[PDB]
Design a protein around this ligand. Structure first.
Ligand SMILES: [Ca+2]
Ligand SMILES: [Ca+2]
Ligand SMILES: [Ca+2]
Ligand SMILES: [Ca+2]
Lengths: 291, 291, 291, 291
């Protein structure tokens, strides 16, 4: 089951597409619906015709309906430095270093992984909506990541593509500015669908691809496979929920491995495209904030 | 106007006490009520007898009613290193240092202050309720702070006492563990009231006092005045709201200056008392989390 | 307990006055509150000062608050011809008569009493609000009645004064026009309070008094005691609920004995005052409907 | 557009069927949807497959879904003696008569028609649900009628089949018992659909057919056309709304012309079938009330 939501005349409608192309309109709340499918694979609703899912991915935006965030995640959390060579996060001399070793390569080795609060639902956007660059950021990058939808017990309800938009220049300036660099209006994008757990046989065998498009020009292209992930997801979830209750429908984003250069910073009207196998391609335009 | 809330048989009731001891039961939502008083100093409700405010502060807990969080703040944010000598936050050789200067004494000097996400409402507790020490923390300290209640425009609606409970050992281990050290169940306490802006003539002239009580024993006592605050509140608010929309009733906590030693770590059944002039005294028992 | 409601800036507030003059602001819904007092005589709320109940009865209407319908009764039902000499309801030759005996004097004798649907809540008005005379009625009279508040099981939750406003000329024209004569906008008034069952020792010993006031002039005055009621209330309730479920807070009005003459018909700007012992006096101005 | 509702696992879903057999699942409230179609003939929703409307009419009741009342009418009103020869309503000597002429043949002639309150929504049932015979009624008949759905201005939003279930023996006993004979649990049935105004070209040219089925046996069969209606619907609506506000979705039932005999009274387990051209056939089992 691949799950998506549209906004129509002020109200939401949620639809699920099956492997045989049949589209089902949902009766329940999408988060409630994912929790159901997790237990017994049951879906409540009616089969619908005249809903062009493929056109929605391309155009947005057809007649009356517009695709958006598939769910409203009550909390979005992030997990840092889970990949090979992710330690070199700003290799300039010098960043923050404890006993000669940098803070980022410390966490890569340490038992306890990095976990940070990323966004509230109203700070998130969906497929076809604009992500943002802070007014006071000269170097902001998109971070293409595999993200999991969780229940209150930390059980994986599904997978999605997430863009952890990071004002990298503020982070490099001082690690204590990380929250300012990560948490703002339009700092987070996910979609276009949330695939159910059974739609992906192996989460550690998926192709993530980033493309930044500036006036038709491919400004950056890079891709990495999930087999390069060292810190496993189950461990990230374990440290997330420890003494820390999360609501149903929490999204955890698993960290990035595709890092564009110092010159590849985002600017107004850019088009960020992220592709993950079996899920789809998330396309979000970029909007530079005015001071 | 000094504003407080009680829970009674599953439902909330909000009361306001005036300077002449008269107590008013509120008609509106407390956050909505603070926004009103901010504009024209109007209070909607009836004067009530038989509500013993002084007994509520001491006992909790009288007949049918129990004092709790005065409001439900949709978001709680924190501001770090705003005081003199707050730079020495773990002076051990070495913590995180950029170009020989430590990250904490960098922020003290830098134009951009430290701002971090602290808690969601359900992670907060009130007067007489238990704060928590993480199951995996050997050194957790309370941080006595002056806190402001804000509207969506960043206007100060009122003041309160806040305990920013911090698992200091995890922070010292690596600054990237800060979110884990700060954000958890029972990580935050505030109250017992929210005083309106006009109840404090000068916010930079208030006595903050910390007391940790272990089996009747005064385990720690320290106090500092707000005149020692270098980073002004208006500046902290400015950087909080920048490209970052906050809901009505957001609490910002302004940073601490009272820091107990390495030996003064919290443990089960402790009693943390925090006093700020004109506001009152916040008393919260301590509960150690089981693994 | 004597229960009343006020409207204040678009919202309702319910208050209860006790025998020792102490006034309590209610926590619960008034219908829910009456059901509670019926079981264990418990009242949830706070004692309030500055609520001038006596002034509310006279003026309406003080500062911010206006008295209105004490509850919103989901259904209002009526019971006809329960009094001595009520058989002579329009003695003119002739009204509707079966086998030489008139339909009204038939019901007075018959095992089965008269029960009719009277109003929906939005068709009812309260103390100080305007009752109405239909645009096509030349002879409309008020019917001063003792009314009971019922739960779904038909248990008496309390007593109130009710005005069953009846377009008597339409009824006399044809008994099948009774629903048109009884059910319309402003066809029903009750209040000013609902007294709890224990406030009246004997419901069959109460003085009901009607007064129609035209420009300061006492246009009609009449009064009768409830000891003149032949058809008992418990029997009226029995036939009401039979195969007919009623919601909680249903009002049953027990029939009238004070009937003004053919010349004493109501007209615009009249003042109808109804008094019942231990309850109070219900005052409603009259408003003639335009065609 | 022909509109119907189903109940599924505790919640309602509304569907519309078009003339070309295409079935649309509705986005809006059915009453809100009828008001829309009345203004511009616009329908909000998605075309659905796998909803077997024809099977729903026969079986009820398929898998997960059960047909019921197409809407929840806030008020149901009735209009009496609108047909030829309807004057002979119980011709026995004697019923209620004014000046030698019977009350029923008076209303047939009089300018003012008969209008009565019939039911609240919770007293109504739908296609496939049980209608009721009062525990104290020895002669109860179904009254097959054309019914209109109205808005607050008295505009016709659509048509449906309605059964005005009447305890005829109580009415014959005394006309003042009419409310008891008409208003009770399961006193009213309508459906199976509500057809939009444009689905019927001429409301005064429709075949209404009654069938009472006792253990497979056709116990009664009778039918009459709407061209035999003397009192027009527009006039019935006019007298309904006069000084009497009705909510959106009010149903008015236009009176019957098919009257079974004194021996044809209803009893337990009977099957009452009513057919009106272009609308469908309403089938409701009968359930005798226990004392
Ligand atoms: Ca990231
Ligand atoms: Ca702090
Ligand atoms: Ca009456
Ligand atoms: Ca009828």
């Amino acid at each position: 089951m691949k799950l998506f939501r549209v906004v129509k005349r002020g109200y939401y409608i949620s639809y699920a597409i099956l492997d045989n192309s049949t589209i089902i309109r949902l009766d329940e709340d999408p988060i409630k619906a994912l929790m159901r499918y997790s237990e017994n694979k049951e879906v409540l609703g009616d089969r619908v015709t005249g809903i062009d899912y493929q056109s929605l991915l391309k155009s947005f935006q057809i007649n009356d309906i517009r695709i958006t965030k598939p769910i409203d995640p009550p909390e979005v959390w992030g997990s840092g430095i889970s990949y090979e060579m992710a330690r070199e996060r700003y290799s300039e001399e010098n960043v923050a270093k404890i006993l000669g070793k940098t803070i980022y390569e410390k966490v890569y080795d340490a038992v306890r992984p990095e976990i940070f609060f990323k966004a509230t639902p109203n700070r998130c956007v969906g497929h076809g909506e604009a992500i943002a660059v802070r007014s006071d950021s000269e170097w902001t990058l998109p971070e293409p990541e595999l993200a999991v939808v969780l229940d209150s017990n930390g059980k994986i309800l599904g997978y999605t593509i997430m863009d952890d938009v990071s004002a990298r220049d503020l982070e490099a300036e001082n690690p204590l500015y990380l929250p300012q660099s990560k948490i703002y209006a339009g700092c987070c994008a996910f979609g276009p669908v949330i695939v159910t757990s059974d739609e992906i046989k192996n989460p550690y065998s998926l192709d993530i691809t980033l493309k930044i498009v500036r006036e038709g020009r491919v400004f950056f292209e890079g891709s990495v496979n999930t087999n390069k992930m060292r810190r496993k997801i189950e461990e990230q979830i374990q440290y997330l929920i420890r003494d820390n209750p999360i609501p149903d429908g929490t999204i955890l984003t698993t960290g990035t491995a595709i890092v564009p250069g110092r010159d590849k910073g985002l600017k107004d009207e850019d088009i960020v495209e992220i592709t993950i196998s079996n899920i789809g391609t998330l396309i979000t335009p970029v909007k530079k904030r005015r001071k």
